[PDB]
Design a protein around this ligand. Structure first.
Ligand SMILES: *[C@@H]1O[C@H](CO)[C@@H](O[C@@H]2O[C@H](CO)[C@@H](O)[C@H](O)[C@H]2NC(C)=O)[C@H](O)[C@H]1NC(C)=O
Ligand SMILES: *[C@@H]1O[C@H](CO)[C@@H](O)[C@H](O)[C@H]1NC(C)=O
Ligand SMILES: *[C@@H]1O[C@H](CO)[C@@H](O)[C@H](O)[C@H]1NC(C)=O
Ligand SMILES: *[C@@H]1O[C@H](CO)[C@@H](O)[C@H](O)[C@H]1NC(C)=O
Ligand SMILES: *[C@@H]1O[C@H](CO)[C@@H](O)[C@H](O)[C@H]1NC(C)=O
Ligand SMILES: *[C@@H]1O[C@H](CO)[C@@H](O)[C@H](O)[C@H]1NC(C)=O
Ligand SMILES: *[C@@H]1O[C@H](CO)[C@@H](O)[C@H](O)[C@H]1NC(C)=O
Ligand SMILES: *[C@@H]1O[C@H](CO)[C@@H](O)[C@H](O)[C@H]1NC(C)=O
Ligand SMILES: *[C@@H]1O[C@H](CO)[C@@H](O)[C@H](O)[C@H]1NC(C)=O
Ligand SMILES: *[C@@H]1O[C@H](CO)[C@@H](O)[C@H](O)[C@H]1NC(C)=O
Ligand SMILES: *[C@@H]1O[C@H](CO)[C@@H](O)[C@H](O)[C@H]1NC(C)=O
Ligand SMILES: *[C@@H]1O[C@H](CO)[C@@H](O)[C@H](O)[C@H]1NC(C)=O
Ligand SMILES: *[C@@H]1O[C@H](CO)[C@@H](O)[C@H](O)[C@H]1NC(C)=O
Ligand SMILES: *[C@@H]1O[C@H](CO)[C@@H](O)[C@H](O)[C@H]1NC(C)=O
Ligand SMILES: *[C@@H]1O[C@H](CO)[C@@H](O)[C@H](O)[C@H]1NC(C)=O
Ligand SMILES: *[C@@H]1O[C@H](CO)[C@@H](O)[C@H](O)[C@H]1NC(C)=O
Ligand SMILES: *[C@@H]1O[C@H](CO)[C@@H](O)[C@H](O)[C@H]1NC(C)=O
Lengths: 49, 49, 454, 420, 99, 50, 99, 50, 50
């Protein structure tokens, strides 16, 4: 999406690949975790993501 | 999920009139031209295609 | 049966028609031993009431009491419920403090109040707010009794809002006004409808504090129930002209019809229990020197004099008569609305404002707005009868719809509107921070001067 | 210059200690010019004439303090209610010392009833602290009542909100029945063995007989009851190894009497520090309006912090109870109440006595089973859950996929297509 | 230095530390017009985008009724106080009492 | 005046089952009531037409 | 410790790694010494040379996707944070019980 | 009529501090209401003029 | 530390101009100071490329 000339389009869309996600690694024993999870699901659950 | 959001009110009023029990009912209805569109998960619809 | 009648000084009701409340009443008298004892009392002290209970209980076995109050002491109703847990006699609290909403009734008492619960009155008030489409509101609750289940019902109603009610958080006051911490809680309110939950003189003090701080504008509405208001005859100081109250003490539906219907219910209960069980008189002999067939779990289904006067499971009427009043500019609590059987009807759907609140409060905030039906701009649709609510991205409007082609009468139809100009008006009300007065045109199109007539 | 004090008390020794403590209260508390007097009522069985004597002795005396001081009344209803219901005519606080029920804990049912005796919700908080000690989460709650049971459930949800977690199972029923064994067998198949009970004597005896019949007195059963469950035949029916709680110095009468006198005395002196003090008038002579300094007196009383006390640091909470009261953890060993610990404040102090469980060792039995068996619920999902009727009886055809992988089916149980 | 140069130094500190959400509490202390005016002509002329809360004014000895609310209308980070020394002691004691 | 759960959540929270093996709609509604795990499927919504 | 008992637990030590669609770490404005307000400040522990280990903290600007996520979390969760960079390298690799 | 009767000390001999009830005097004077006067009614704005 | 307008506004506000007859981009900021006429031309923006 920023390629000069746009001569590179990858094979597939993750169908024959790992297809993982990205998250936030918190320390074991943090009370912030449920609040951060609710905030992320609010950020996805309204179209803002 | 659409009832929470800020602009999905008319589509909510349209979808609440003809809610279906199973997804196979929706498949048979859109197959028999009773429906014309259906919101559904993408890869399941690719498998059904 | 033998039923005692005692009152105070409510509505200047004479005792003569109370003594004459036996002749034409109960024309189909199947129980023979039905008599009345109709008296009065100078005072409202509960100890003398206990004295009269112990006098009349041994007074030829009186098996009934119909008591009404003129004051605002709800503890007298608690004393009568305690006596009904001792004498086990069905006692009807009619008006005043004898029928006020206490916290939690017990199954070990047969005392009955007339009216509805505080949650049903809150449902009626939220039905009023739904009919008037005022969605951004506040809730100020003190340590006034009955607060727990009332605030819980408000929270479950806002959490179950198909309307999408914007409730500002619960302003709590542990004590009276400190003028340090309670003032900050009063100045957090920027909503439209302020809901106050306290006693009468506490409401006078809170309205005086709000008027002294300028929190009593026509943007800042005030709706209180009957238990916050108190006596309908006494109107104290610092009331905004337009004070919405919901009560049931109508001067058109007076005390005499209430006590006649109550005696009709008691004689109906006596006749219904007489056809089922024989030994109906079962009472305590005398109060000195200390549960078979009662009427508490017996009169759930009853419809007396046509109107539904049935009993709830929590000791109230199923369908009472609700009266919604406001305050005019003449310091009078004027009757506005009544309640239907199932739903709620309102006479003044068009809402007056009663501008004379203070020395000067201008109506420059509101702007008269009229438009024409335009498919990309003014999208006009019906109101949903299943919800009776325009959804929150749409705004309601009124239309003067004429009935016939050669008449001068027309009604007002409220319809929903969405579109481009709706969004423009909403964003102008966000930025310029004004209020809108939206209605529809009845003469026709945009404009054309037909011989110096537009 | 005289002020009467209303007390529901009949013993002359406690009244002598009361008058001596009043003389102590008027001794060093400043140059204030009040004098104090006692007025106490004795035992009468007839509760109507009890309330009659109470209101005749409260109206005709101009009292400031009303102290109910008879817990073991011969009436099984145990109702000090009409005293507070009469004093609510002027919103006068009755400072009783008898009951420990959540139906009395309401500021809405009882208008201004203050006390220094806590209900069983504080015992539930002590049990929550004990669970914080033994590091347990999942419980089984059984409350026989419904009036105090809702307040106990709300206090339990408050403790869960402090935990920021949830409980497992709560139950309520109607007392008088005897086939609550089925609910205990439903609670058996859970993943915890922690039993919390809120009941009277009869319901406790019924569930102890049920525990004797359903083999609920084996190993791992964690029993946790309170005060109304360790009396009567339920004390006889209690299994050896059950844990009870008892607050110290409550059954000893005169010490908490003296603590109440110190609280009332310092409250009256800090009330009479300021000006414009009104008095509750005589309700029998022309006085039907409310006492105007009712909420003022409640602001003084509910915000009264104390550093004096025979029991300890007494202080009223947001509901009008004792902050951080002392408790004693008792255990039953061969039908003998053996003390196995105490609890002040926020900290548990177990003594050097054997904390013996109804099962095996003195260490805690973890009733959290390994849960080898699970229950899978599903819907007929069109890409995922393919449901086929069986061939003959409960059998599945061992079919293959396109790669020779056999389709490993499972014998599931499904309802009909349309439920109504 | 003048009060404008010292305000320039303080806003240079705030620019080096990037505390964009701030406030301004000015009493009846002398030099208040040019001070607030220079804060206006520095923040409003800035390309940074400073989050400027409106000016809270304290007139006299506090009634602790309206001035308490005006102190509790501050939810920013930086609180700029403009008074004398004993008035600073009184305002910081009130802010410690109000949290 | 309470919205209660039925179906799979209504049977799980009542203790009738132990695990809902299903294409769970992980959202902000159900996160406020139960705890979650990591998703196995990464899938979007679209429109079926003719 | 502004006072005796003050809970300060809203401070969150946050380190990140430079990624072109996510963590865009760029220079400061050389004319105003100011990060543009959609960016956030960061410090980088730049050592003197390869011989010594002590170094300074160069302040740089940060935009991108994860910066927007952090700003929206600071709007929602309402915490405080400190942003810096690690010089040991990439995301994570345990070199014989040494990450 | 009010309390906190403070007096400005004699600053010439042995008095160096400031008069701490200055804004107290401002609260007394600048909030005065008038309904009588020979030349007419005086009233205080934020500046305190006629 | 003061920002000033110049150019056509600097020639107009000084009294050295009476009417700027020019299709000016009517924005919000310049209309906050002086009154503007009715916009006769409706014209947008575009990009010139080779
Ligand atoms: C008995 O009561 C006191 C009441 O305070 C409690 O002691 C507290 O606990 C900590 C534990 O380290 C002690 O250091 C302090 O003396 C007390 N702190 C506070 C804030 O009160 C405790 O519940 C019991 N005694 C013990 C074990 O300290
Ligand atoms: C009591 O009776 C007198 C007449 O004897 C009357 O004037 C008074 O109003 C009565 N009291 C009340 C509460 O109405
Ligand atoms: C009243 O009548 C209806 C219909 O017969 C029935 O539900 C019941 O007998 C009464 N109402 C109650 C208690 O449900
Ligand atoms: C309401 O109920 C009364 C009494 O049953 C009845 O007479 C009246 O017609 C009803 N009105 C309507 C239409 O709801
Ligand atoms: C008015 O006139 C129209 C056209 O003749 C007719 O259809 C309608 O019934 C009349 N009634 C109304 C709406 O006033
Ligand atoms: C007036 O309108 C009503 C309602 O449509 C209709 O019933 C009536 O016939 C009309 N009047 C006439 C005579 O046109
Ligand atoms: C105290 O009260 C009792 C009972 O009312 C009374 O007999 C006695 O005289 C009183 N004593 C004094 C003087 O306070
Ligand atoms: C309780 O009821 C069930 C119903 O099946 C019965 O099997 C069981 O024996 C009963 N138990 C008691 C305690 O009677
Ligand atoms: C049940 O009773 C048996 C009797 O042998 C005993 O061994 C066991 O410990 C008891 N506990 C259980 C498993 O309920
Ligand atoms: C109650 O406590 C006091 C003080 O500790 C003690 O002297 C007295 O003996 C105790 N009384 C009883 C009944 O134990
Ligand atoms: C006594 O007077 C004060 C005003 O000085 C006022 O709060 C109220 O009228 C009374 N109550 C108390 C004790 O403050
Ligand atoms: C419990 O008893 C101890 C004895 O030292 C005392 O210090 C403590 O205050 C008591 N707790 C309370 C508040 O009852
Ligand atoms: C459930 O209902 C039908 C009704 O005919 C019954 O025959 C069958 O056993 C079940 N079938 C389905 C759809 O599960
Ligand atoms: C030491 O560090 C600098 C950058 O700070 C760079 O030129 C190179 O790494 C080394 N050279 C010297 C001596 O500057
Ligand atoms: C440190 O080592 C690197 C890699 O050899 C090289 O750039 C140069 O020798 C030194 N300078 C720095 C700080 O990179
Ligand atoms: C005197 O000053 C103190 C402290 O500001 C204040 O509490 C008190 O009300 C003042 N008294 C009067 C009326 O001057
Ligand atoms: C100002 O002039 C009017 C008209 O002469 C006069 O009545 C008024 O008294 C004057 N103002 C004063 C002196 O208050």
């Amino acid at each position: 999406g920023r390629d000069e000339g746009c001569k590179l389009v990858t094979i597939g869309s993750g169908y024959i690949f790992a297809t993982t996600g990205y998250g936030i690694a918190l320390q074991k024993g943090s009370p912030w975790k449920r609040q951060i999870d609710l905030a992320l699901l609010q950020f996805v659950g309204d179209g803002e993501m | 999920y659409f009832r929470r959001q800020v602009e999905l009110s008319t589509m909510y009023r349209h979808m609440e009139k003809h809610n279906y029990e199973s997804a196979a009912e929706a498949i048979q209805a859109v197959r028999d031209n009773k429906l014309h569109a259906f919101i559904w998960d993408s890869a399941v619809l690719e498998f059904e295609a | 049966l033998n039923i005692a009648v005692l009152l105070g000084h409510s509505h200047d009701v004479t005792e003569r028609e109370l003594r004459n409340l036996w002749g034409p009443e109960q024309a189909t008298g199947l129980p023979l031993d039905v008599n009345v004892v109709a008296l009065l009392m100078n005072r409202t002290d509960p100890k003398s009431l206990i004295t009269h209970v112990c006098d009349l209980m041994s007074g030829a076995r009186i098996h009934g009491l119909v008591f009404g109050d003129d004051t605002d002491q709800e503890a007298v109703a608690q004393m009568l419920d305690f006596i009904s847990s001792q004498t086990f006699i069905p006692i009807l609290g009619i008006s005043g403090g004898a029928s006020m909403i206490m916290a939690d009734k017990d199954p070990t008492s047969t005392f009955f109040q007339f009216g509805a619960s505080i949650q049903q009155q809150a449902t009626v008030m939220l039905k009023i707010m739904q009919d008037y489409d005022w969605h951004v509101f506040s809730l100020v609750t003190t340590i006034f009794p009955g607060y727990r289940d009332f605030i819980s019902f408000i929270k479950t109603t806002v959490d179950n809002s198909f309307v999408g009610w914007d409730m500002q958080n619960v302003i709590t006051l542990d004590t009276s006004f400190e003028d340090a911490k309670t003032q900050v809680q009063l100045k957090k309110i920027h909503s439209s409808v302020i809901l106050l939950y306290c006693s009468k003189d506490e409401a006078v003090l809170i309205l005086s504090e709000a008027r002294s701080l300028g929190l009593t504008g026509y943007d800042f509405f005030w709706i209180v129930p009957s238990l916050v208001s108190g006596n309908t005859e006494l109107i104290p100081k610092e009331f905004p002209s337009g004070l919405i109250s919901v009560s049931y003490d109508d001067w058109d539906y007076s005390l005499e019809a209430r006590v006649r219907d109550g005696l009709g219910i008691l004689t109906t209960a006596a006749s219904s229990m007489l056809e089922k069980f024989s030994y109906i008189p079962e009472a305590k002999a005398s109060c000195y020197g200390q549960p078979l067939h009662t009427l508490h779990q017996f009169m759930v289904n009853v419809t007396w004099d046509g109107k539904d006067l049935s009993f709830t499971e929590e000791g109230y009427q199923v369908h009472p008569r609700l009266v919604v009043i406001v305050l005019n500019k003449d310091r009078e609590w004027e009757k506005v609305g009544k309640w239907e059987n199932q739903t709620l009807s309102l006479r003044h759907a068009v809402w007056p404002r009663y501008k004379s609140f203070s020395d000067c409060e201008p109506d420059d905030n509101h702007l008269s707005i009229v438009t024409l039906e335009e498919a990309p701009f003014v999208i006009v649709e019906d109101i949903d009868p299943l919800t009776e609510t325009c959804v929150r991205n749409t705004v309601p409007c009124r239309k003067f719809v004429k009935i016939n082609n050669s008449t001068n009468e027309g009604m007002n139809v409220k319809k929903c509107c969405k579109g481009f100009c709706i969004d423009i008006l909403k964003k102008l009300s966000r930025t310029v921070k004004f209020t809108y007065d939206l209605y529809l045109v009845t003469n026709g199109k945009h404009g054309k001067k037909v011989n110096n007539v537009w | 210059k005289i002020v009467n004090i209303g007390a529901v008390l009949s013993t002359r020794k406690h009244e002598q200690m009361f008058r001596e403590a009043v003389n102590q209260a008027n001794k060093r508390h400043g140059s204030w010019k009040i004098q104090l007097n006692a007025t106490s009522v004795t035992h009468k069985p007839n509760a109507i004439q009890m309330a009659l004597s109470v209101c005749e002795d409260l109206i005709s005396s101009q009292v400031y303090a009303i102290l109910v001081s008879h817990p073991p009344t011969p009436n099984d209803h145990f109702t000090p209610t009409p005293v507070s219901y009469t004093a609510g005519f002027y919103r006068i606080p009755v400072l009783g010392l008898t009951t420990r029920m959540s139906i009395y804990s309401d500021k809405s049912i009882h208008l201004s009833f203050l006390r220094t005796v806590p209900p069983y919700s504080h015992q539930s908080s002590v049990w929550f602290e004990m669970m914080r000690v033994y590091n347990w989460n999942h419980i089984i709650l059984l409350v026989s009542d419904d009036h105090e049971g809702r307040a106990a459930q709300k206090r339990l949800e408050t403790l869960l909100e402090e935990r920021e977690s949830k409980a497992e199972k709560v139950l309520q029923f109607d007392p008088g029945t005897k086939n609550v064994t089925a609910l205990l067998m439903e609670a058996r198949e859970l993943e915890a063995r922690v039993i919390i009970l809120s009941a009277s004597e009869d319901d406790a005896a019924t569930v102890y007989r049920a525990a004797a019949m359903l083999n609920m007195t084996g190993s791992g059963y964690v029993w946790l009851v309170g005060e109304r469950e360790i009396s009567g035949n339920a004390l006889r029916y209690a299994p050896d190894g059950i844990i009870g709680l008892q607050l110290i110095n409550g059954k000893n009468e005169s010490a908490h009497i003296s603590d109440a006198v110190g609280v009332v005395a310092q409250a009256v002196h800090e009330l009479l520090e300021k000006e414009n003090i009104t008095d509750p008038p005589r309700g029998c002579v022309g006085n039907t309006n409310i006492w105007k300094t009712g909420p003022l007196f409640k602001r003084v009383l509910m915000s009264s912090k104390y550093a004096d006390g025979v029991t300890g640091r007494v202080e009223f909470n947001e509901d009008g109870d004792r902050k951080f009261a002392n408790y004693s953890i008792m255990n039953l060993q061969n039908r003998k109440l053996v003390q196995v610990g105490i609890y002040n404040g926020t900290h548990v102090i177990p003594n050097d006595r054997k904390i013996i469980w109804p099962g095996g060792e003195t260490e805690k039995p973890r009733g959290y089973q390994m849960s080898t068996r699970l229950k899978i619920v599903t819907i007929h999902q069109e890409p995922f859950v393919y449901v086929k009727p069986t061939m003959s009886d409960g059998t599945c055809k061992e079919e293959f996929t396109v790669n020779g992988d056999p389709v490993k089916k499972v014998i599931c149980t499904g309802p009909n297509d349309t439920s109504p | 230095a003048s009060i404008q140069q010292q305000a320039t130094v303080m806003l240079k500190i705030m620019q080096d530390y990037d505390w964009h959400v701030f406030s301004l509490v000015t009493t009846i202390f002398p030099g208040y017009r040019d001070f607030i005016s220079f804060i206006k002509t520095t923040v409003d002329n800035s390309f940074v985008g400073w989050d400027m809360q409106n000016v809270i004014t304290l007139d006299t000895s506090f009634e602790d009724a309206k001035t308490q609310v005006q102190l509790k209308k501050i939810h920013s980070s930086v609180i700029l106080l403009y008074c004398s020394k004993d008035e600073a002691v009184l305002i910081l004691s009130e802010a410690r009492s109000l949290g | 005046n309470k919205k209660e759960w039925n179906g799979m959540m209504g049977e799980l929270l009542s203790g009738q089952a132990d695990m809902i093996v299903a294409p769970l709609t992980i959202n902000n509604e159900r996160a406020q009531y139960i705890e979650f795990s990591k998703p196995f499927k990464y899938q979007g919504l679209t429109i079926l037409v003719k | 410790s502004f006072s005796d008992c003050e809970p300060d637990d809203n401070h969150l030590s946050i380190v990140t790694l430079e990624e072109a669609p996510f963590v865009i770490v760029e220079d400061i404005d050389p004319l105003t010494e100011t990060c543009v307000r959609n960016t956030v400040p960061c410090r980088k522990f730049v050592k003197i040379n390869n011989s010594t280990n002590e170094g300074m903290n160069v302040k740089k600007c940060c935009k991108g996707f994860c910066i927007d996520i952090l700003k929206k979390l600071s709007r929602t969760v309402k915490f405080t944070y400190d942003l810096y960079l690690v010089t040991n390298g990439k995301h994570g690799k345990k070199v014989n019980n040494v990450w």
